[PDB]
Design a protein around this ligand. Structure first.
Ligand SMILES: C[S@@+](CC[C@H](N)C(=O)[O-])C[C@H]1O[C@@H](n2cnc3c(N)ncnc32)[C@H](O)[C@@H]1O
Ligand SMILES: C[S@@+](CC[C@H](N)C(=O)[O-])C[C@H]1O[C@@H](n2cnc3c(N)ncnc32)[C@H](O)[C@@H]1O
Ligand SMILES: CN(C)c1nc(=O)[nH]c2cc(Cl)ccc12
Ligand SMILES: CN(C)c1nc(=O)[nH]c2cc(Cl)ccc12
Ligand SMILES: [Cl-]
Ligand SMILES: [Cl-]
Lengths: 380, 380
């Protein structure tokens, strides 16, 4: 019954993640002034460049140069020695208003509760009782390893660290009638951008002792655990200089790490009318509510929409064999307890609030008791 | 036992798909001259702009202006009336060499069979016996509806069509010990960019009669099937003008439509050393080989890598209950029959061949008998 499963995560300075954070910094800046801003902000990053491309219709007055540069500063790219500098990079803007054809078909002259979905598409929510936060241990550990790197970089413990990092954790699991039980950590990968002076052995030792041991419980690590620490051997060039980044290129790191499923939509840079984000958040809320409500040990939820139509076109449940109730019964409980129209989700999950940049690194789920992480008490 | 499942697809002129096709046109152009080109070409599209950003180390002499414009011409954006024109758009290039730190850690001075993975990451392969091509019916139908639109546009049957389109199909399934059996089509969505002159009723009638009926077997359609045809009511603005596109933003349309799982990596614009593509192709090959070999009715395969390391870090199998063999036994059969090092996958799947632009619309799988679609005869 044992098997392996692998998930990854990336740091705040990974170039795709830089784009997600900037996209969400732009969204938040708009929402601070105009709670009804229509935002679809893509970000692209390459050597010395942040480009914003997309569509925004808003009453806010946003200083894009300031918002972008402040987000880059927060990440830690503040000097040409690190490969990227918020003070001196190029910020290019190719932002237009939202298409009037989309606006008229989605929200113009519509009662908010009855606004149409901002696009068609499919979205999934997932929850697993293997951790208290109802997330896969593989991705929780991978996120915490990146967070630890950023912590040691920021506190000056490991001053040779740079913001760009990736981690990957393979866990050996057992299964019990569809639920999954972590046994041990089989393999860990860590790659992190570093300065020109530190040697490989100093980095590998610090990664094992100060990073992995500070995050992963010793009970999961043993003589057989495989460690791939700085496996490329050298990672001085990094950030956008090493690899072009784009918004919405870490959608599995943003969600469930390979577990469950994904509908394809990116979250960052989008207001609530874009169901790629709001309905995925609501589907996480449903899944977590079914697990915390004791109806199942793990569950996957699908929802789908058509542009301009408020009610979902379909809702589906996969409980992996972890409920005594059938999937048909769980679906009925979901339909009796939730209303997944985007104009209702916005109210339940408070999706006009400018907290989106906080979601754009370390996963959107299983952290900080955001509204979609607080289970709904179910009636049936 | 019945349930719904939804998948989507998009047309060749959907702005994200335009970027995938251009990224792969660039890759193919390099491979035609240098089979060992190292390519990591991202494309961004917005009104009047194609931007290439990324890293290429190659001995080829590629005319980016010509390659980009020819790809856009093929798609059909050839006039300002359509919102985008290959003859007169801006083509911007921000392409650098591959990071020497990556090159030295991945492939420099390495025997080809022993080249390291070009990155860490996880990848999944999936196959289902519900169609002969071993793909989910939901996404096969969604792809064929977009292909039909392009066919009717190109042959002049529906001259009001433009290249940007999206489709979505919800199928009602039954299940049989983990395998899935399509019963009927529950809902279809079609949205397609159109000219200023055609009215909504003419478009809705043509979409039902000339598109849906020409693709979806009548046995799946009944009095209860729901049709959302041009649900936004107006879609004159389209292509990159209506919505910024990026490479690798249709990864679920590229794969399994919500079925199975995804590791997060984009395929287009990457040579074989980027396991995001090669290992996903190999994992599809494994899954399809297990189903066509009669070992299971449907199956999901995970593989993972560390940058610079040739052998996968993990391999896992989920057979949904559709094999008499355990997942442990199937994994042993996979390890005895396949070698998922990238330097072996390249030889088995002929991944230096410049056929990538052909993969960049209508899904990478279940079409055209590419090498990863030809099952391997298994020995056990
Ligand atoms: C390996 S790069 C993708 C391939 C790359 N575009 C190329 O040209 O080969 C993906 C991510 O890996 C990380 N990376 C960059 N340089 C690296 C290095 N020298 N060693 C390890 N990881 C690296 C960064 O997080 C980067 O965004
Ligand atoms: C709805 S747009 C995404 C949201 C958009 N960025 C915004 O500013 O609201 C996503 C895709 O839908 C399609 N689309 C564009 N305009 C549309 C319209 N008027 N009606 C329906 N679909 C449309 C195109 O395929 C486009 O790439
Ligand atoms: C066989 N069934 C019931 C499913 N098979 C899957 O592969 N995944 C699913 C995902 C959802 Cl959300 C619902 C149903 C299924
Ligand atoms: C419980 N097991 C065996 C799994 N549970 C999943 O949810 N998905 C999987 C995917 C793969 Cl590739 C392998 C195993 C599993
Ligand atoms: Cl990456
Ligand atoms: Cl889209």
């Amino acid at each position: 019954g044992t098997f392996l499963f692998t998930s990854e995560s990336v740091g705040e300075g990974h170039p795709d993640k830089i784009c997600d954070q900037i996209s969400d910094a732009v969204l938040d800046a708009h929402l601070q002034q105009d709670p009804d801003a229509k935002v679809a902000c893509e970000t692209v990053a390459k050597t010395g460049m942040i480009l914003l491309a997309g569509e925004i219709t808003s009453r806010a007055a946003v200083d894009y140069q300031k918002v972008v540069r402040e987000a880059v500063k927060h990440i830690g790219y503040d000097d040409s020695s690190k490969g990227f500098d918020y003070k001196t990079c190029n910020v290019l803007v190719a932002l237009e208003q939202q298409s009037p054809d989309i606006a008229q078909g989605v929200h113009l002259d519509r009662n908010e509760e009855d606004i149409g979905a901002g696009d068609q598409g499919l979205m999934f929510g997932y929850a697993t009782d293997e951790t208290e936060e109802c997330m896969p241990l593989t991705i929780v550990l991978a996120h915490k390893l990146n967070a630890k790197l950023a912590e040691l970089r920021r506190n000056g413990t490991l001053p040779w660290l740079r913001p760009d990092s990736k981690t990957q954790v393979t866990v050996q699991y057992m299964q019990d009638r569809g639920a999954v039980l972590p046994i041990r950590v089989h393999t860990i990968v860590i790659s992190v951008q570093h300065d020109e002076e530190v040697c490989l052995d100093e980095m590998r030792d610090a990664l094992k002792e100060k990073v992995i041991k500070a995050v992963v419980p010793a009970k999961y690590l043993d003589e057989d655990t495989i460690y791939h620490l700085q496996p490329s051997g050298r990672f001085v060039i990094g950030g956008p200089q090493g690899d072009a980044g784009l918004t919405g290129r870490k959608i599995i790191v943003d969600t469930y790490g390979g577990w469950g499923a994904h509908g394809g939509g990116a979250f960052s840079g989008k207001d609530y009318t874009k169901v790629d984000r709001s309905a995925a958040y609501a589907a996480r809320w449903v899944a977590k509510s079914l697990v915390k409500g004791g109806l199942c040990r793990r569950v996957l939820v699908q929802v789908s929409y058509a542009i301009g139509v408020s009610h979902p076109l379909s809702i589906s449940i996969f409980h992996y064999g972890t409920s005594q109730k059938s999937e048909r019964e769980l679906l009925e409980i979901v339909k009796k307890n939730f209303d997944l129209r985007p104009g209702v989700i916005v109210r339940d999950l408070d999706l006009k609030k400018p907290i989106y940049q906080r979601t754009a690194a370390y996963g959107h789920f299983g952290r900080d008791s955001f509204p979609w992480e607080v289970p709904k008490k179910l009636k049936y």
